Design a protein around this ligand. Structure first.
Ligand SMILES: c1cc(-c2nnc([C@H]3CCNC3)o2)ccn1
Ligand SMILES: c1cc(-c2nnc([C@H]3CCNC3)o2)ccn1
Length: 339
């Protein structure tokens, strides 16, 4: 494990150098052509763009500054960009450029054309245990990396996991990620994936990412999440009870892993014990996993998405196409000085 200790020590050195001196203002809007909207939200959207001089394709996340302020997301938005420009790991989407103008904030990422894990899971129904285990091992390594840097991710769900041209995962959307030594308190995340200590308004820590990994593995292997209900208040009641029913087709090793990740007592939850991530890596359900081979991307993927080239949008869906307007006057300049 010395080689793992020294890898993580080097990873932290390189993150901290970029964290302390973040890059800013590395492109501008009229360097790109707009192609298609890939997703939309409360204060921002993600567009496929093409760089006019190089011809490269990118995914550009665009946030309306005035709406960020109104939804009280200033701190979270600054978190997202400062973390994304500082990290480097095989299963994290790469931030290529960032900039701002009178109206908007922009984060320009590599474009991953295979689509969201959500689409593929819902089309096929459920993943076999080896298929789920291939994806789960990538998230285990990514959380080991993020947590060693004192980062909590806080938005694990199938919609945020993109599948690349080799069938591996690229994690996207750091809107709720935060550097945290100790506890933190914000209510955020999707209802089906929230740990009990978030719902109960406690000070919580990185163990909430390991709870969310339990939810994700269950959903990949069953086809639906463990605390499913029609409205959030009913979901929250099932989460805090912790009663979980497992389908009969689950293996005994899978049920045992999930009982330890979906542990309502955070001081007993796998990932948060004295042996840290190794209680997960050494569990019987991962016995066939070569952790080094996954990191080096040398395992053949269970599934390669169908797409025609780096500009193909066929694995994403259709949204109304709205203008990208930039006001003649600067909005919210002070609030976003550091961006
Ligand atoms: C303190 C507060 C926050 C924060 N961010 N959004 C919120 C929500 C409260 C109102 N709706 C959004 O609170 C972050 C860090 N410290
Ligand atoms: C393609 C897409 C993206 C991307 N970034 N954030 C998102 C969110 C949009 C909806 N759920 C995820 O998608 C990055 C690279 N290629």
């Amino acid at each position: 494990q010395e080689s793992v200790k020294e890898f993580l020590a080097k990873a932290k050195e390189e993150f901290l150098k970029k964290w302390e001196s973040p890059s800013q203002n590395t492109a501008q809007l009229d360097h790109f052509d707009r192609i298609k909207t890939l997703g939309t939200g409360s204060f921002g959207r993600v567009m496929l763009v093409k760089h006019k001089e190089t011809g490269n394709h990118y995914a550009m996340k665009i946030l309306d500054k005035q709406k960020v302020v109104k939804l009280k997301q200033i701190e979270h938005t600054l978190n997202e960009k400062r973390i994304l420009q500082a990290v480097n790991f095989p299963f994290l989407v790469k931030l290529e450029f960032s900039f701002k103008d009178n109206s908007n904030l922009y984060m320009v990422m590599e474009y991953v054309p295979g689509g969201e894990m959500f689409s593929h899971l819902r089309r096929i129904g459920r993943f076999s245990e080896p298929h789920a285990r291939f994806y789960a091992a990538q998230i285990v390594l990514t959380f080991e990396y993020l947590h060693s840097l004192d980062l909590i991710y806080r938005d694990l769900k199938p919609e945020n996991l993109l599948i690349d041209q080799q069938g591996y995962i690229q994690v996207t959307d750091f809107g709720f990620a935060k550097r945290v030594k100790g506890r933190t308190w914000t209510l955020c995340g999707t209802p089906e994936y929230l740990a009990p200590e978030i719902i109960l308004s406690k000070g919580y820590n990185k163990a909430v990412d390991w709870w969310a990994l339990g939810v994700l593995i269950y959903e990949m292997a069953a086809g639906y999440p463990p605390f499913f209900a029609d409205q959030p208040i009913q979901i929250y009641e099932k989460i805090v009870s912790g009663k979980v029913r497992f389908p009969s087709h689950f293996s005994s090793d899978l049920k045992d892993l999930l009982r330890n990740l979906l542990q309502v007592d955070l001081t007993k939850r796998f990932g948060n014990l004295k042996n840290g991530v190794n209680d997960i890596k050494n569990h019987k359900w991962f016995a066939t996993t070569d952790w080094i081979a996954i990191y080096q991307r040398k395992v053949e993927a269970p599934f390669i998405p169908k797409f025609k080239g780096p500009g193909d949008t066929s694995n994403f869906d259709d949204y109304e196409e709205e203008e990208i307007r930039v006001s003649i006057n600067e909005k919210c300049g002070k609030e976003f000085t550091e961006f």
